[PDB]
Amino acid sequence: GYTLWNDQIVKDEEVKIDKEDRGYQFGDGVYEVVKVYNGEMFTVNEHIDRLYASAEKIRITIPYTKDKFHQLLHELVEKNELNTGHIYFQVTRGTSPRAHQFPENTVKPVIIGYTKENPRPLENLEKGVKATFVEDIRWLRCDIKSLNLLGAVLAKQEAHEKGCYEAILHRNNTVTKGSSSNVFGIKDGILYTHPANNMILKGITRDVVIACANEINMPVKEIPFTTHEALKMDELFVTSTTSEITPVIEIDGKLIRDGKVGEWTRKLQKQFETKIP
Amino acid sequence: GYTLWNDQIVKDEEVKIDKEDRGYQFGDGVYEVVKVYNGEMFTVNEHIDRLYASAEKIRITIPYTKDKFHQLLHELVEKNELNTGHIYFQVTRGTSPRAHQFPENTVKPVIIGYTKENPRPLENLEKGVKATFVEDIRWLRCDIKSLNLLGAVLAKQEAHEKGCYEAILHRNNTVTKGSSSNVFGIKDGILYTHPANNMILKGITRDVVIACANEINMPVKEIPFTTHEALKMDELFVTSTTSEITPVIEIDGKLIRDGKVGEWTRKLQKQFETKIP
Ligand SMILES: *Cc1c(COP(=O)(O)O)cnc(C)c1O
Ligand SMILES: *Cc1c(COP(=O)(O)O)cnc(C)c1O
């Protein structure tokens, strides 16, 4: 296949990472994941804006204009002939001899991007998924979508070992986020979800679902709910670019309500579907 | 130069990292940094035991024995003819297509290790340094020396822009550790330092200093102290393999006592010298 390397589309083999790439040794980089539906990139601009925003938060300067970056992303989809799946891309501060502090502005940021054929998780969208409560041990800057993810892999892995799809993180017993997604809860026709602060990444799918909720005249309250209040909800689902709107029907062997995908979830999934290419 | 790559000492050029190297995308891996004093490695067994310990905490199985590793490290010191500097080595889970949960027991961990000429910070060890208080926003598993270091880089950089050497981290106004070192406080001939828990990395230099205190009949209290109490210490300093015992004589424009290196610090630095090759 083809991989985007800085400003070049090259063959995977030709691509190589240096042992002193700040993202390799420190996790000094940012990233994004864009979904493609039949050759069409879903909400690409939203994703491109956040890359630049996340890079700016750690004072990384991307050498290209959002336009040059958009074009490069499109060329990559064609060269790979990606139909339905996703585009992954990141930016690290660049390569320099090991040191914690920032290097000299001289260092060029390394950019890597590639594709993968991956269909929508239809079975999960229909029948729902299992989940587990895992304690939040991640760092305090989750608003930045960076490569500092060791906290997430340990959470996700615990979920997997129990046969769960996602792990729901909570700090001070208050639900925050999923290892790799945003958590929503529904009680009496009202949508609840933890507000946007340093505790959670302000997801793009998360924002679309709030627009969808506003469109179908459903009220939304960005109020934090506890893990006990979570098990008392009528419906519960998680969101992420790849997961879309995945229903959560059971947490730790405790069926949410009756253990069936709710009607409001369905309406949101039905409304969301209209925005997809 | 020569780079240790898995089980082969090869030239920097023959070594190549893959973009789906879990340590590159998730910071999924651990590391160590040993000091070499005139061809002789300092406390090398202690460091290798913490590498294997740190790997075990995230379920990484190093394919070689502690001997094969020791042997390899020694070859690397000779091939590079390293006199006085340090060795940096690390282990990642390996290369596998992008996914948060662990891959299969098939994937081999990628091992990297290389040297660097770096003298002793004589100036700092004699005249002391300036520091700055920075809030601890790191993940909750610092007991593991992992590659999830974005919190550390962001802290060091802040100290750096303020012309300070190190950043003294505090969580809930209680001093925990530096961006990349352990903190010690002295008040009335008694040695104070934060106890070993998930909040701090149990450093090797830290333990040496604690042994050096017992040997010189100095009382050690592993009681955490606040920032308000830190500013009231007779003496203050930080430790690490590369900073050894660096004395901090000022925190944010505020001198620690008279702004001179304390006598107890001098006695510890003197005793520490006896353990060096
Ligand atoms: C990437 C990510 C998400 C999802 O954001 P989307 O834009 O919906 O893909 C949610 N939470 C965390 C912690 C993430 O890293
Ligand atoms: C590596 C490290 C240290 C120092 O440990 P040493 O064995 O003395 O080098 C101290 N604090 C943190 C946070 C570290 O990561």
- Give the ligand 2 atom nearest the CA of B142: 13
Which residue is catalytic, options A145, A156, A177, A267?
A: A145
CB of B175 closer than 8 Å to CB of B238: no
Buried b or exposed e, range B190-216, using 16+ CB within 10 angstroms: ebbbbeeeebbbebbbbebbbebbeee
Please tell me the distance from the alpha carbon of residue A63 to that of residue B51, in angstroms, as a whole number: 37
Enumerate residues lining ligand 2, CB below 6 A. B 142, 145, 177, 180-182, 201, 203-206, 239-241
> How far B243 CA sits from the closest chain A CA (Å)?
13
Which chain B residues touch A140 with a CB distance below 8 Å? 137-138, 151
List, as one string, the DSSP characters of A74-92. Answer: HHHHHHHT--SEEEEEEEE
Specify the amino acid at residue B128.
G
Specify the amino acid at residue A39.
G
Specify the amino acid at residue A35.
K
Nearest ligand to the CA atom of A240: 1
CA-based radius of gyration for chain B:
19
CB of B40 closer than 8 Å to CB of B147: no
Q: What are phi and psi of A7, to 5 degrees?
A: -120, 25
User: Is domain A119-277 annotated with CATH 3.40.720.10?
Assistant: no
CB of B76 closer than 8 Å to CB of B9: yes
Please tell me the distance from the alpha carbon of residue A217 to that of residue A264, in angstroms, as a whole number: 11
A110 at interface of B, judged by CB pairs closer than 8 A: no
Active site residue A145: yes
Resolution in Å, one decimal, please: 2.9
- Comparing CA positions, the residue from B45, B111, B117, B31 lying closest to residue B74 is B45
Please tell me the distance from the alpha carbon of residue A137 to that of residue A175, in angstroms, as a whole number: 13
Extents of the domains making up chain A = 1-118, 119-277
* Token couple for A211: 């627009």
* Token couple for A51: 């890359």
Return the CATH number of the domain spanning residue range B1-118: 3.30.470.10
Which chain A residues touch B157 with a CB distance below 8 Å? 100-102
Please tell me the distance from the alpha carbon of residue A149 to that of residue B148, in angstroms, as a whole number: 7
CB of A166 closer than 8 Å to CB of A230: no
